[PDB]
Amino acid sequence: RIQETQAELPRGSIPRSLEVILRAEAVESAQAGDKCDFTGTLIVVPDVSKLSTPGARAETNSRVSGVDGYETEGIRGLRALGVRDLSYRLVFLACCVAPTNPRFGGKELEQTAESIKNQMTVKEWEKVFEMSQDKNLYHNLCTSLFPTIHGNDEVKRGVLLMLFGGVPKTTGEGTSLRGDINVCIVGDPSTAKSQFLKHVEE
Amino acid sequence: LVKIPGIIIAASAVRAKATRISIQCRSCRNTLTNIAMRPGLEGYALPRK
Ligand SMILES: Nc1ncnc2c1ncn2[C@@H]1O[C@H](COP(=O)(O)OP(=O)(O)O)[C@@H](O)[C@H]1O
Ligand SMILES: [Mg+2]
Ligand SMILES: [Zn+2]
Incomplete structure (x- = not known):
């Protein structure tokens, strides 16, 4: 099940949801919460749902008429004439799924560092390597992540480190060591807490 | 609809149909x-019903 993206919504409306059918090799390609592009066809699927009223229906064109004792009326008459409701619903049948905004322009696919690097293009990894070698990268990331926020440098730095996170571990006894930091901003009104959260969300 | 000639050699009793x-x-x-x-x-x- 997918649903309408937020930028597509008209005024006063809830996002429409349609169910897309993925087949043989596209079959695991869209995960919950993923912004995806689906290429395929919009199809109708006969759905069994009525009592809005009797609606459109199909029946034989052959002019049969039940004899006395077998009058083609009621349920026997509907069964004899092959009467069925022509009720349908729209469904997308996707031949192909792609991320809407791809991360690396090269090629998606175990997610090791080399897999991510191979996933890139040449210019993309030029940039990645460049900024990895960037002295003063910490400040540059803080400034390029929160441009419109003045001051609050520590909050920028901490939110950045949250974005990068630590290393999860497992103890021999089975204890799991948390490897990603949590940050809480406490502040007076209008000090841009919601703005930090919106920056990170977007 | 056919038209044939002939001689009648038996005539059953009239019954009720x-x-x-x-x-x-x-x-x-x-x-x-x-x-x-x-x-x-x-x-x-x-009819059986
Ligand atoms: N350095 C700053 N300090 C305080 N407020 C700022 C700063 N920069 C921008 N603002 C503005 O203050 C407004 C209130 O921010 P908001 O996060 O909505 O309030 P709150 O912190 O109460 O959730 C925002 O529109 C934001 O743009
Ligand atoms: Mg707020
Ligand atoms: Zn009876």
Whole structure:
């Protein structure tokens, strides 16, 4: 099940949801919460749902008429004439799924560092390597992540480190060591807490 | 529709063949009147319900 993206919504409306059918090799390609592009066809699927009223229906064109004792009326008459409701619903049948905004322009696919690097293009990894070698990268990331926020440098730095996170571990006894930091901003009104959260969300 | 000549060598007794029949249900006693019978040597199968 997918649903309408937020930028597509008209005024006063809830996002429409349609169910897309993925087949043989596209079959695991869209995960919950993923912004995806689906290429395929919009199809109708006969759905069994009525009592809005009797609606459109199909029946034989052959002019049969039940004899006395077998009058083609009621349920026997509907069964004899092959009467069925022509009720349908729209469904997308996707031949192909792609991320809407791809991360690396090269090629998606175990997610090791080399897999991510191979996933890139040449210019993309030029940039990645460049900024990895960037002295003063910490400040540059803080400034390029929160441009419109003045001051609050520590909050920028901490939110950045949250974005990068630590290393999860497992103890021999089975204890799991948390490897990603949590940050809480406490502040007076209008000090841009919601703005930090919106920056990170977007 | 054919037209043939001939000599008649036997004539059965005149009997009674129904043109319309009425049938009644054994339990609810409701009737299924004025069922039209086909003319000629043709029979009728009663409704089974
Ligand atoms: N350095 C800053 N300090 C305080 N407020 C700022 C700063 N920069 C921008 N603002 C503005 O203050 C407004 C209130 O921010 P908001 O996060 O909505 O309030 P709150 O912090 O109460 O949730 C925002 O529109 C934001 O743009
Ligand atoms: Mg707020
Ligand atoms: Zn009866």
